[PDB]
Design a protein around this ligand. Structure first.
Ligand SMILES: COc1c(C(=O)CCC2CCN(CC3CCCCC3)CC2)cc(Cl)c2[nH]ccc12
Ligand SMILES: COc1c(C(=O)CCC2CCN(CC3CCCCC3)CC2)cc(Cl)c2[nH]ccc12
Ligand SMILES: *[C@@H]1O[C@H](CO)[C@@H](O)[C@H](O)[C@H]1NC(C)=O
Ligand SMILES: *[C@@H]1O[C@H](CO)[C@@H](O)[C@H](O)[C@H]1NC(C)=O
Ligand SMILES: *[C@@H]1O[C@H](CO)[C@@H](O)[C@H](O)[C@H]1NC(C)=O
Ligand SMILES: *[C@@H]1O[C@H](CO)[C@@H](O)[C@H](O)[C@H]1NC(C)=O
Lengths: 532, 532
């Protein structure tokens, strides 16, 4: 049968779903690991043991246990990121969309969701793989992984809670794809991994990690990279946060076993309830339980690996949006509101930068402030707002990614760089927020192709050219097809450093993306913080 | 007799000189001090003891002993600054231009020359007082003072070479004006001191020093100010350089008396020959023998005085030229030439900043570099040239002065600020040097009124409006003729921070002269260097 597939662990039965006046095949909620429940909380994932009978792969799986956003209840702009089904620790599932009829040896694309390593789900509406899988005739997979403490509680030296298990989940799903995607008409030799924000960083992390390199061919990174400040911690810091988590729940802290055993008796939301409390600073764009530089998943520091060329060498396609920072100011910085234009006072601006660069000393703070203040106009609330937006975005996303793109291109086999700066005509967030962190995503997934979503002709065309770039890249390592000149996306090189704008307008080529700000963030500021 | 004048120290005979189809009285080379010779080199100046008979004050006196610049022999652009008279240690004289007929009790303006405290002459063609005295009917006085080692060798504790004696020369000349200016028709209660560069700095130094305040009514500062980084040194540094000067001359260094004795037997030119060797670093815009923060001419640190309001409260009129830096790059930095466009390579631009901020640590150097480099275009030889020009001008003149004008204004009784940015139509220096340090002087002194000098009609008009400002300010404390037609130069207030452009175009008001850069020099950079 087309819907019935015998995999290396059992038979699964999928469903025929419609898409754009046609249909494709969907297999939802296939398990790829043993339920990381009970005594297996915090432990490495174990491969899903073979089942007898047919697995109902007809409906989305549970979502992983995560903090749930309630700032704006009812509000679609924030609620679209929240879990859209039951939360459970039994959440290690993946989903597959196969074009109908089933192709032979076609290109595979594995989605990896963001959410700052504390949240995120594969079952979200924006990650509906049907449009992209159908329009671009690729086998589309979306995996899942443990988030928050469940995924990234790190007590180095313990084999009970080593850290990074959330990335290991992703690896096991990648390993599952390598073993079974051929049964779905997928070529396991042509797998492109891709993800946004935290998902972006994850993609990069699998590039660096040796135990991950052979489980995929190429990589797309959207608005995230492995070296992001919010995206990892030392073993010392992971331990400290872990120990501090026990403290918030009256746990025994004399040993890891006692500490771990304690945290395992607690219910999931008990952990989540106190999760934010282990952060060292009052901060924004910082998350408690994130990957650790352990010496195992990552043999040595990210920078050194980047320097020595110790990573997977292939093609990467990567980029950022114009206003990466606004979402996080709204949730964590004074003066910002979803309902005003959020002109920021000088006072809230100063307040802002302190939250944004939580680890800086006073000289570092003055440096950042100077770097973003127009002194002919320091009490301009609009410039102060856009300034703070750029500080958050440049520091957490754009500049970390550029450092990565420059480092990778020395050893890579082809880099493509984009700047996404279209603002959706139907955005429900206020104008001041601009081109928001996460909002290129709906374009990648072909959401503008559906008429009821009320996008414009030009946005549908944009999404269509975007999906094509994505998939074409995925099959060939080049987002370009050999005709027109309308237009060719240039290769990013060490010398000329080209990239392209992604919007409704005809393609423009620029050079040196946010280089002025990024020299500050990548070279001056770090040298300054080390020095002082 | 108009030309014969009985002063407190003896009779004096001047001479009738022609000016612009008319005539005025000059009194050239009037002594105000005992010749600081022999046992009195380095020593405080002593008043000129009374003479018999009639002094022939009809010719220009000697110029003080100084480094003569031989870079462009024959070239008028450099040679206009060199000694136009014989050099000697017997140089403590002043010059007076008196309207004809002699005014009853008219405004007095005393000129103090620049030259980095190492050079300078009262007798220069460009400091010729006849036009200004004549046109605005003021009594114009030209003082002099010992420069370099002779004027500013400082060995704290010693009474033989205490430091600051050249500032004391100035004071003594001011004292002479106080005692004798009435005999020329001048009001000793209405004396404006003015000077450019070192003169400008000196003018503010008298503003600060308690023992100089009662010797003048108000102050004009052009392209210099007391807080300039080149304009003073500490006791420690001052001694170290003095001791080093003796080391370069095989002097006994075992005590101040044996060092001073050794340096006193040397011919002046021997001193000057090694003068530059005692500088701490390879630098531009640095000079070896300058005023000392000594606890006597300056009771406390210059910055503490400005803070406490410890200084003369009167009116000041002050400003800068658009390209303070070019003159010094030409004599000091790689890539700069009188005869090319001096487009600067990135490597030379690097060398430039190290030469220009010779006290910065590496972090400091990185900050300056970042602050002035456009990283989309870093190999632009013009942008690198202009940028290094701005670095020099902003660091050494513009930003010091803005610091001064802001601090002063909190206690002052009226501030006027100008940005001089006209390039003379007949400049002999290359186009790339722009509006040069010291080239507003010829406009202040009325040289464009003389037809054979070949200034344009618009430049003569500019000199006239500029002289009227300086004079009107000197008479009333305000450059504007109140309730007259012409547009009015606004007060600089700590809130609005207004100033004007000075050029051939109608007047423009602006606010916050070079804030962005001066915030960096005055606030950020010193914080960076103070850290460890
Ligand atoms: C949960 O809210 C916070 C934060 C935040 O960082 C909120 C900003 C995120 C909220 C949701 N959204 C998620 C992404 C997921 C991947 C694709 C793009 C959208 C945007 C970012 C910070 C602190 Cl300190 C908080 N404290 C309490 C709640 C809370
Ligand atoms: C003598 O030059 C130097 C320097 C300098 O930085 C000074 C260059 C000056 C040349 C004369 N010029 C005229 C001024 C006079 C005052 C009014 C305005 C115009 C100003 C610039 C530095 C070093 Cl290390 C030197 N070594 C040898 C000569 C020399
Ligand atoms: C799979 O589960 C769905 C959801 O409950 C159900 O409607 C469907 O009938 C099931 N399929 C089979 C073959 O049992
Ligand atoms: C990719 O690898 C091939 C084979 O080694 C090489 O010829 C090609 O130049 C590489 N491309 C890039 C952009 O590095
Ligand atoms: C003053 O000096 C000038 C020039 O040297 C000379 O012509 C004049 O005669 C002198 N005056 C007297 C009274 O000797
Ligand atoms: C100057 O001082 C006088 C006398 O105290 C005062 O009336 C006047 O307002 C002052 N002017 C300024 C500009 O400070």
């Amino acid at each position: 049968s087309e819907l019935l597939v015998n995999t290396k662990s059992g038979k699964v039965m999928g469903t025929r779903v419609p898409v754009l006046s046609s249909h494709i095949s969907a297999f939802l909620g296939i398990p790829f690991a043993e339920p990381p429940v009970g005594n297996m909380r915090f432990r490495r994932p174990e491969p899903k043991k073979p089942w007898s009978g047919v697995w109902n792969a007809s409906t989305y799986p549970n979502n992983c246990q995560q903090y749930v956003d309630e700032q704006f209840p009812g509000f679609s702009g924030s609620e679209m990121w929240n879990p859209n089904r039951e939360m459970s620790e039994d959440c290690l599932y993946l989903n597959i969309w196969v074009p109908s009829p089933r192709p032979k040896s076609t290109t595979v694309m594995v989605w990896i969701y963001g959410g700052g390593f504390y949240s995120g789900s594969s079952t979200l509406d924006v990650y509906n793989g049907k449009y992209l899988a159908y329009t671009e005739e690729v086998v589309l997979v979306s995996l899942s992984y443990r988030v928050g403490a469940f995924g990234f509680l790190a007590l180095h030296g313990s084999q009970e809670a080593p850290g990074n298990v959330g990335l290991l989940d992703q690896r096991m799903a990648l390993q599952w794809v390598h073993d079974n995607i051929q049964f779905f008409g997928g070529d396991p030799k042509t797998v492109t991994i891709f993800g946004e924000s935290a998902g972006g960083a994850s993609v990069g992390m699998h590039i660096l990690s040796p135990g991950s390199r052979d489980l995929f061919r190429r990589a797309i990174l959207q608005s995230g990279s492995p070296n992001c400040p919010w995206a990892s911690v030392s073993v010392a810091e992971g331990r400290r946060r872990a120990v501090e988590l026990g403290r918030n729940l009256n746990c025994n802290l004399n040993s890891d076993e006692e500490l771990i055993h304690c945290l395992r008796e607690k219910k999931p939301q008990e952990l989540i309830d106190v999760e934010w409390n282990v952060l060292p600073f009052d901060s924004i764009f910082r998350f408690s339980f994130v990957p650790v530089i352990d010496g195992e998943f990552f043999p040595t520091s990210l920078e050194s690996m980047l320097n020595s060329g110790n990573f997977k060498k292939t093609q990467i396609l990567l980029g950022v949006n114009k206003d990466e920072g606004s979402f996080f100011l709204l949730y964590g910085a004074p003066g910002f509101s979803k309902d005003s234009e959020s002109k920021i006072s000088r006072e809230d601006f100063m307040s802002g930068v302190k939250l944004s660069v939580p680890h800086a000393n006073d000289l570092g703070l003055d440096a950042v402030t100077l770097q973003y203040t127009d002194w002919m106009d320091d009490n301009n609330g609009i410039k102060n707002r856009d300034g703070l937006d750029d500080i958050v975005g440049d520091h957490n996303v754009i500049c970390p990614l550029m450092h990565f793109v420059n480092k990778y291109t020395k050893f890579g086999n082809g880099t493509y760089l984009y700047f996404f700066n279209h603002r959706a005509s139907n955005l429900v967030w206020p104008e001041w927020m601009g081109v928001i962190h996460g909002y290129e995503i709906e374009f990648v997934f072909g959401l503008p192709l559906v008429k009821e979503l009320n996008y414009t002709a030009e946005e549908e065309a944009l999404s269509r050219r975007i999906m094509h770039y994505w998939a074409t890249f995925a099959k060939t390592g080049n987002p370009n097809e050999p005709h027109s000149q309308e237009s060719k996306w240039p290769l990013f090189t060490t010398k000329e450093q080209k990239f392209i704008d992604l919007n409704t307008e005809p393609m423009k080529v620029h050079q040196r993306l946010r280089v002025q700000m990024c020299v500050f963030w990548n070279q001056f500021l770090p040298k300054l913080l080390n020095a002082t």
